[PDB]
Design a protein around this ligand. Structure first.
Ligand SMILES: C[C@]12CC[C@@]3(CCc4cc(O)ccc43)C[C@@H]1CC[C@@H]2O
Ligand SMILES: C[C@]12CC[C@@]3(CCc4cc(O)ccc43)C[C@@H]1CC[C@@H]2O
Lengths: 10, 236, 230, 10
């Protein structure tokens, strides 16, 4: 998954 | 969703309360400017702002009702527009200058230190002068920034109906602010049009900014963060 | 000027009467032949666009160089919004000419064109979903002409833009929309111009790469309009 | 000296 994906999930 | 239940004044207070902070740059006035250092300052600042923008996006009404995939898409298409409108907003009270940070105020001559940057600088300054000419208010600015987030990537996707419903509520909010300011119905429609046409210029600046970012990446001059690289690859 | 004294109905009639004609394409698509047909067609439409711009109220009141600046910035957007307008009644298809109706699969024989085709098709279906009317279309195309380059005499251009906004609202109120639906629809139409600006920027790069391809013979006029974007 | 100039003047 992308970094933006992680930062958007919590 | 709950964003469809907010009044105009509740929409404004929600957007004002969600505003990101004003960050400082690592700029040291003792360092003489180089093309690599000046790019490093601006790209470092943009990377730190991106983290706050993501958490600001979550607080925009209607954005959390979207799927995680649609959240990524909207931010991928709009992140540079949102950085740019934020930059021109806090530069309004500084004619001929771009306030990247309270300790980093630059004019178009500084932009000559980086090849191809003055073209971007002049457009950013022209947008800031336009906002100062129109006497753009903070309540209108936060509405325009939320419109960009929801509108820029919406033409590249039933979830679109929900987004357009939120966009319409923001339009109702813009009209409500203008009527509250004593504007006639004709002036409300005219000012609404003037503000939304600027977003066309902001999209133009973002397109040029991406190409400028891509050129500096291929030159391997400025160290770009992993997050910024992923946002850059998303436009290709 | 003269555009400011016109009524909303006279503004609509002036824009409708100024509409350029629908041109035909030159009567097994290769990348060279496909790009050849599309650029040949775009060049011939540019000639009619310039004379259409003269008939847009307020455009003759500008200096020659301001007219050049606006057309240099907006010509590809104007071609694109015109293409998506006449493609509205052909879902999933782009009507470049009455004898040249193409789909995205055909846009594959030219590398990089599919993305632009998909964006154009997305705009056409958005217009179709909103039920864009011809009187609204000619207002938007005029707005593109005056707005796209205005951030790069300016008070007059902004006064004409306000006049077109009044005309747009006049059409929506005449169609039976409430005050809320009027400013909502106004906002919906103007936000599409941001996407149209996006498509144009993508189209400039695609045309610039095909220039350095030496794939397609581009007319001198088309090359000069392309060189205006440094 | 541009083609666009003479197309706008005529
Ligand atoms: C570096 C750059 C200058 C301006 C940008 C856009 C708005 C912004 C805000 C911010 O806080 C930092 C940087 C920026 C990022 C651009 C990418 C290319 C352009 O030359
Ligand atoms: C050729 C081209 C495809 C479509 C364009 C945009 C709108 C248009 C209208 C028209 O009547 C003819 C051609 C076109 C010109 C583009 C430039 C690059 C892109 O590949």
């Amino acid at each position: 998954h992308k970094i933006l994906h992680r930062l958007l999930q919590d | 969703s709950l964003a469809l239940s907010l009044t105009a004044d509740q929409m404004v207070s929600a957007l004002l309360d969600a505003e990101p902070p004003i960050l400082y740059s690592e700029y040291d006035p003792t360092r003489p400017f180089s093309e690599a250092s000046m790019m490093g300052l601006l790209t470092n600042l943009a990377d730190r702002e991106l983290v706050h923008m993501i958490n600001w996006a979550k607080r925009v009404p209607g954005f959390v009702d979207l799927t995680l995939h649609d959240q990524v898409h909207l931010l991928e298409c709009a992140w540079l527009e949102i950085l740019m409108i934020g930059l021109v907003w806090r530069s309004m009270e500084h004619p001929g200058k771009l306030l990247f940070a309270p300790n980093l105020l630059l004019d178009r001559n500084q932009g000559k230190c980086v090849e191809g940057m003055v073209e971007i600088f002049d457009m950013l300054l022209a947008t800031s002068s336009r906002f100062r000419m129109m006497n753009l208010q903070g309540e209108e600015f936060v509405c325009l920034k939320s419109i960009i987030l929801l509108n820029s990537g919406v033409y590249t996707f039933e979830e679109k109906d929900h987004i357009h419903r939120v966009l319409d509520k923001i339009t109702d909010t813009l009209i409500h602010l203008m009527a509250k300011a004593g504007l006639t119905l004709q002036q409300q429609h005219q000012r609404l049009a003037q503000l939304l046409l600027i977003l066309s210029h902001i999209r133009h600046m973002s397109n040029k900014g991406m190409e400028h970012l891509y050129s500096m990446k291929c030159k391997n001059v400025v160290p770009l963060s992993d997050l910024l690289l992923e946002m850059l690859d998303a436009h290709r």
